[PDB]
DNA sequence: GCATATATATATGC
DNA sequence: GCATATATATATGC
């Protein structure tokens, strides 16, 4: 038997790969439960997302199957269907090992959330079966993997097509050996494409479940505005979507903003259309530009007087409503861990804070009336603030 | 030439393991900078801790070298030092395959703070070199790598050593190209060692700087009394220290806490001797169990009544200083991601919450008085979370 | 019908 | 400059 006393070079073991990702999926995907699940699905997704921002496909279809498995159809340029240069289909190559494929500054892919080369890898690892369909140059080529992503065909041309026909057509059975839940939820997936089409002016995203028949469709001809409003839906606005986008040293970035009644900070962040839940490197410029152009203008206009101190971030957000969406070249591209929740670009701090910076000081000169109301807001904000903290302290 | 019009096979490349950690440090200490640099050191003390958890040194030194690399020398059972059946000698692969251990339950290890058979792999692709040295057996062996951990020796025996004396010795030097920064702290490595002294009592760590001539020592009996106890230090207290401990399903829970005067709560946790920041199962059934069992103990003596509501968790925390150190096994040991900030492990919200509901209760009914100031003291809190809601409101 | 989680929303302090 | 907790709503499983 293996000991302790007897650590010997026995003990010492090599995963292959993807059974490493069965064994610690925790660090592939983040849990087993639910939100694991749809990890996967939001992998297979990104994959046509980074297609279409490259330019090719205007169609993504999403589709639960009746028994369970998960669709994503796109219509982009097609994986690759010769032989990869190790000797295995180069579809082999992107769904059996890791850290292998189109993103690591080669020039297949412009900008793009994938980085990592796992994704495809990951899902296929984590499925009981999983088959994928290409169409290019005229031919239909598929190919199926069983029991943690093992071959069990070679990929195999099974039909042809219109020549201008071309795209990509996974599907998979998660496990149900590795993960707690198995039902993918139509709520979370619908609500998860909702926000991806708001970020391709020109892209329509679908999700059909062949278990309710339920489906619905996504496009949005105005992108980043259309998903301000979309916030503010059934609440009550104090101010127009501003709408700022810019260019910078390859970085690219558009924002929309419109304050609400309310009282919340609610602001949504995207690096290459991957939703960015913990902010990072590009929030942190849009924070800054606001708290910097709202208290300065203020000092100009003598709304906060001279020997008066400066208004906090936290005031000048509070009813605030924002996407921010920016395009970072993969030669600067940082997140913080195998996921994507939090950026690291150092660059992207100034980018962003920059051209924010520019174009609000710009629209406050402009709308005095709006801009004015909206420092005397940020100061009943503050007054608040102030108030809450005495009392709690008198309490002591 | 490959570009967005021209991917076919070769726009897909395959990364060499130690290369993708250079590729993407992100995914793998998830920066680059004076957080990242301290990353690789927390990995080669994990990897020594992990043996005397097992059971293996009694000692744990650490060295800033001039030159400005850092060693890490333990008396454990060492690295095997044969030849490993994948065609290299066993150290190699440590520092070399990534995926490759002996913690995923074969049975070198009791229960460790590693899982994911990469740490060792990443600290020498990370460095401008690296340097092992194991005894065993008599001998001294030793391998030594450059340019982000290509062998530029093979597992070389060096020497004599006495036939029961065993250890590891790391040398490595980070990688100026890859980190913004590559100056080691020595205030950082003193507290994080200092903490990681507190839950090991059969351990003295160490810590020299020869940059500057000054070294600490570590050594504790007591666990985490002796944690809680240092965390209130110069703070005033108000109550003894508190130490609950118990069993189940082969976890291990052990928690010390105590209160000061102030309005702060510090709470830390662990998991197998690895700092949790992001708490996890773990710290929530702590967090739980106390809300629970002291509401509970509100009306049940009558200090909250039928028309009262239930008192909130962070009312019961404030000045609640607390040290959480549960040993988890490897067949549930799973962390949200690459980067073990924080647990995952489902069965450790009930374990925790478990072990400490049942040993507080008993503890409360049985310390009425001190029982009775805690409740007092949830209930001023209360007062003051509840005026300033009011004082707030009442200015918008 | 009971308690389960789930979608959402505010709350400062170190 | 940085980490969610829950408050209480509703929807759904034991
Ligand atoms: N739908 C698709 N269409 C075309 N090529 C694809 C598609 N999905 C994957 N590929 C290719 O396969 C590679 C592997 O992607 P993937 O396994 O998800 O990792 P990745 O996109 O690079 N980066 P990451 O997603 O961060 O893991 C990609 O870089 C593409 O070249
Ligand atoms: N100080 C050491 N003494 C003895 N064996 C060691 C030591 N350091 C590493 N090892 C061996 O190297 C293996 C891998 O080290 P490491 O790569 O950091 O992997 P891990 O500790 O298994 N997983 P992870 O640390 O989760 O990032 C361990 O399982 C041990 O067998
Ligand atoms: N009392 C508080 N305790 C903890 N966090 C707080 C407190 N008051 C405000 N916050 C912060 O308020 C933020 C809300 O803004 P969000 O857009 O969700 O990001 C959180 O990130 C919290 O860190
Ligand atoms: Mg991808
Ligand atoms: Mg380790």
Same mark, same amino acid.
């Given at each position: 038997?293996?000991?302790?006393?007897?650590?010997?070079?026995?003990?010492?073991?090599?995963?292959?790969?993807?059974?490493?990702?069965?064994?610690?999926?925790?660090?592939?995907? %983040?849990?087993?439960?639910?939100? =694991?699940?749809? /990890?996967? $699905?939001?992998?297979? +997704?990104? &994959? @046509?997302?980074?297609?279409? !921002?490259?330019?090719?496909?205007?169609?993504?279809?999403?589709?639960?199957?009746?028994?369970?498995?998960?669709?994503?159809?796109?219509?982009?340029?097609?994986?690759?269907?010769?032989?990869?240069?190790?000797?295995?289909?180069?579809?082999?190559?992107?769904?059996?090992?890791?850290?292998?494929?189109?993103?690591?500054?080669? %020039?297949?892919?412009?900008?793009? =959330?994938?980085? /990592?080369? $796992?994704?495809?890898? +990951?899902? &296929? @690892?984590?499925?009981?079966? !999983?088959?994928?369909?290409?169409?290019?140059?005229?031919?239909?080529?598929?190919?199926?993997?069983?029991?943690?992503?093992?071959?069990?065909?070679?990929?195999?041309?099974?039909?042809?097509?219109?020549?201008?026909?071309?795209?990509?057509?996974?599907?998979?059975?998660?496990?149900?050996?590795?993960?707690?839940?198995?039902?993918?939820?139509?709520?979370?997936?619908?609500?998860?494409?909702?926000?991806?089409?708001?970020?391709?002016?020109?892209?329509?995203?679908? !999700?059909?479940?062949?278990?309710?028949?339920?489906?619905?469709?996504?496009?949005?001809?105005?992108?980043?505005?259309?998903?301000?409003?979309?916030?503010?839906?059934?609440?009550?606005?104090?101010?127009?979507?501003?709408?700022?986008?810019?260019?910078?040293?390859?970085?690219?970035?558009?924002?929309?903003?419109?304050?609400?009644?309310?009282?919340?900070?609610?602001?949504?962040?995207?690096?290459?259309?991957?939703?960015?839940?913990?902010?990072?490197?590009?929030?942190?410029?849009?924070?800054?530009?606001?708290?910097?152009?709202?208290?300065?203008?203020?000092?100009?206009?003598?709304?906060?007087?001279?020997?008066?101190?400066?208004?906090?971030?936290?005031?000048?957000?509070?009813?605030?409503?924002?996407?921010?969406?920016?395009?970072?070249?993969?030669?600067?591209?940082?997140?913080?861990?195998?996921?994507?929740?939090?950026?690291?670009?150092?660059?992207?701090?100034?980018?962003?804070?920059?051209?924010?910076?520019?174009?609000?000081?710009?629209?406050?000169?402009?709308?005095?009336?709006?801009?004015?109301?909206?420092?005397?807001?940020?100061?009943?904000?503050?007054?608040?603030?102030?108030?809450?903290?005495?009392?709690?302290?008198?309490?002591?």
């Amino acid at each position: 038997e293996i000991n302790i006393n007897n650590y010997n070079d026995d003990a010492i073991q090599v995963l292959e790969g993807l059974d490493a990702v069965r064994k610690r999926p925790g660090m592939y995907i %983040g849990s087993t439960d639910g939100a =694991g699940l749809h /990890h996967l $699905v939001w992998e297979i +997704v990104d &994959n @046509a997302v980074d297609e279409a !921002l490259s330019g090719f496909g205007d169609r993504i279809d999403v589709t639960i199957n009746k028994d369970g498995s998960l669709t994503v159809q796109d219509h982009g340029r097609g994986m690759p269907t010769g032989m990869h240069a190790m000797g295995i289909p180069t579809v082999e190559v992107i769904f059996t090992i890791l850290h292998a494929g189109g993103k690591f500054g080669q %020039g297949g892919y412009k900008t793009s =959330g994938g980085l /990592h080369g $796992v994704g495809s890898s +990951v899902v &296929n @690892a984590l499925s009981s079966w !999983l088959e994928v369909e290409i169409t290019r140059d005229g031919a239909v080529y598929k190919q199926r993997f069983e029991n943690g992503g093992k071959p069990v065909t070679t990929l195999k041309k099974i039909g042809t097509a219109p020549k201008s026909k071309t795209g990509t057509k996974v599907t998979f059975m998660p496990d149900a050996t590795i993960f707690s839940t198995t039902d993918f939820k139509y709520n979370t997936i619908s609500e998860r494409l909702n926000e991806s089409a708001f970020l391709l002016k020109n892209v329509t995203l679908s !999700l059909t479940d062949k278990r309710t028949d339920e489906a619905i469709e996504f496009h949005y001809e105005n992108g980043v505005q259309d998903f301000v409003s979309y916030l503010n839906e059934d609440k009550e606005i104090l101010t127009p979507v501003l709408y700022f986008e810019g260019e910078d040293n390859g970085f690219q970035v558009e924002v929309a903003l419109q304050y609400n009644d309310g009282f919340s900070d609610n602001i949504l962040s995207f690096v290459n259309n991957v939703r960015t839940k913990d902010g990072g490197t590009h929030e942190t410029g849009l924070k800054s530009a606001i708290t910097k152009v709202m208290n300065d203008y203020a000092r100009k206009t003598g709304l906060l007087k001279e020997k008066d101190k400066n208004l906090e971030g936290s005031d000048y957000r509070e009813g605030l409503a924002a996407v921010l969406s920016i395009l970072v070249p993969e030669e600067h591209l940082q997140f913080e861990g195998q996921t994507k929740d939090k950026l690291g670009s150092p660059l992207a701090r100034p980018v962003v804070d920059g051209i924010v910076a520019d174009k609000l000081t710009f629209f406050l000169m402009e709308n005095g009336e709006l801009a004015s109301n909206l420092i005397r807001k940020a100061i009943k904000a503050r007054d608040a603030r102030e108030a809450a903290r005495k009392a709690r302290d008198e309490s002591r």
